[PDB]
Amino acid sequence: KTHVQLSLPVLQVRDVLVRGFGDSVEEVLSEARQHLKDGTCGLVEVEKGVLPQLEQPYVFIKRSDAAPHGHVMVELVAELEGIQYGRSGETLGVLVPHVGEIPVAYRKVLLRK
């Protein structure tokens, strides 16, 4: 399937234990996709003060369209030193590894595998 329905745990930035997916744009997009497949991916909502508390390169989910079965359609865009790899819509947040942090909410998304 070109798209997969996922329910991502929304984590508070200060709870996150592993604050990024790796060291290159290609590695972070790779690892983010693997963690989304394995159900070990969390989401941090981007507000003032959040990104400096996380590790670059960043992986964003961005809205790819205007929402089947409650699931917003999204795609991945990485960012490193202010350059973005991918072009998409509004940020829904920044992806991080999930290693058992308690969420505050769940965000239903339809991910373009």
Ligand X SMILES: OCc1ccc(CO)c(Br)c1
* Coil vs helix vs strand at 83: strand
Site size toward ligand X (CB under 6 A) is 7
Least distance between ligand X and beta carbon 105 (Å): 19
Residue 3 binds to ligand X (criterion: CB under 6 A) = no
Residue 4 binds to ligand X (criterion: CB under 6 A) = yes
Instruction: Select from 37, 65, 68, 90 the one that contacts ligand X (CB under 6 A).
Output: 37
Residue 78 binds to ligand X (criterion: CB under 6 A) = no
- 96: nearest Cα among 60, 43, 22, 50: 43
Total Cβ atoms within 10 A of residue 63? 16
Contact call for residues 64 and 75 (beta carbons, < 8 A): yes
Beta bridge partners of 80: 83
Residue 26 binds to ligand X (criterion: CB under 6 A) = no
* Footprint of ligand X (CB under 6 A): 4, 6, 33, 36-37, 111, 113
